[PDB]
């Protein structure tokens with residue numbers, strides 16, 4: 001797939017708002033993912049034990065990881081499709097060490113779109129949400145193609 005420059009602009013225009021508070025967005029997004037799809041929390045051996053949303057909000061580790069994830073995602077979006085080098089080490093650790101199924105990457109994509117919609121309504125209208133969805137589908141499609149080359153699948 002290929003986004004047009006106008007679609008990338010819509011993605012980078014709402015992303016520049018997220019980057020005013022990376023840690024807060026990371027927290028929101030992971031908590032939304034863990035509430036919606038609690039099975040995903042099991043992949044994290046460091047947080048796995050958190051029982052409630054208050055415990056999650058209070059976990060410094062969870063917040064740090066959210067920052068990790070969003071910074072890596074932001075660097076991929078900024079490439080505007082030319083992200084091959086960034087995806088390699090990412091597809092290798094998620095397919096071989098962590099073992100994150102594409103299904104989960106869809107679940108977090110949904111969590112990202114939910115939070116942007118809540119926090120940025122004026123910059124996340126329908127066309128911008130479509131473009132963000134297209135940029136995350138692109139990301140999942142390229143990662144899934146690397147997963148296959150690396151031997152991971154199902």
Ligand code: HEM
Nearest residue numbers: 040043044046068069072073090093094098100104105108
């Ligand atoms: C937008 C999607 C994602 C991005 C860009 C991303 C990025 C990262 C980054 C950069 C790291 C640290 C470097 C490395 O281990 O590769 C990481 C580690 C990790 N990621 Fe992902 N990730 C994403 C989605 C997920 C999802 C959906 C899950 C789980 C349901 C997950 C589980 C983890 C785990 C278990 C680790 C290691 C945590 C720890 O340090 O122990 N990732 N991810």
